[PDB]
Amino acid sequence: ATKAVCVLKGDGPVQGIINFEQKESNGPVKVWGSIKGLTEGLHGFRVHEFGDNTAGCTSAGPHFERHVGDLGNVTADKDGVADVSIEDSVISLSGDHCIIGRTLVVHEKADDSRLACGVIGIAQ
Amino acid sequence: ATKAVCVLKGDGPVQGIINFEQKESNGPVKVWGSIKGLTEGLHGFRVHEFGDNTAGCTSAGPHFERHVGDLGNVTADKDGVADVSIEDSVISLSGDHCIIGRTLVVHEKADDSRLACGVIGIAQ
Numbered sequence A, B: 001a002t003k004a005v006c007v008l009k010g011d012g013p014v015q016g017i018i019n020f021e022q023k024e025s026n027g028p029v030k031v032w033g034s035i036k037g038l039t040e041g042l043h044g045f046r047v048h049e050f051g052d053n054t055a056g057c058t059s060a061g062p063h064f065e066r067h068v069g070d071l072g073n074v075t076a077d078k079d080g081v082a083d084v085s086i087e088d089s090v091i092s093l094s095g096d097h098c099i100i101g102r103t104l105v106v107h108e109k110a111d112d113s114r115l116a117c118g119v120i121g122i123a124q
C-alpha cells in the first residue's frame, strides 16, 4: 500500500483531489494535489479519525494541541486555489498511523467550519 | 478496525449506506444497510480493488469467476429498495483480505455499468 487518493467534496464550492505516495514503510508520505473554491489565505488541512461521511464532514470525528492527523495548512491564492505539496513523516499509509480509510478535511480557518472532505482510499 | 461504513452514490438515483462489522479479526463480517433507486430484482454487489473515485466508479478498477470482493447480489423490491443483510467470511476488515479503503459498488446487472459506489471507511 504505497499510494492513496482522496476526492474532497462539500456543501459549498470547495473541491479537490489529493494524492498520497509512500514508497517505503516508515518512510515519508508525499501529499500533493489541488483544491479550488477556497477563500484566499490559510486553511487547516487534517486527517480526521473516521472515514464516515454519512453526515457530511461532521461524522468524520475528531483529529486522527498536536495530532497525527494535523497536516498543517494549505494556502489558497487570490483565485481560491491551493496547490498542495507536503512531505510528512508522522502519517503513514501502513501500520498504526495508517490514514487509509480515514477522512481528509479542509477547514474554514487556519491551523494555529469543515468545508470539504473525502475518505482516503487505496490507489493504483 | 472493527466497524466500517460506505456511502453509495452515482450519476443516477441509486444511493444508500452500507455498514460493516467484524467482532474478531478471524471472524465473519456482518454487512447491512439499505440501497434505494434500483430496478426491481438482483444487482451485483462487489468490492473493487481501489478506493479511487476520481473518475466516479470507473476508477475503482477490477474486482478485489469468483474474487474475494464478490459479495453476491442485493435484491431490490418493487419500490426499488434493496435491504441488505449478510454475513461474509471471505472479506475482512483487517489483514490481507482487508476491504477498508477500497470501493463498494452496486451494479446494473446481476452477478450470476456501475450504478453507484463509495469508498469504504473506518467507522466508530
Ligand SMILES: [Zn+2]
Pocket: A063, A065, A066, A067, A069, A070
Ligand atoms: Zn489536532
Ligand SMILES: [Zn+2]
Pocket: B063, B065, B066, B067, B070
Ligand atoms: Zn469477480
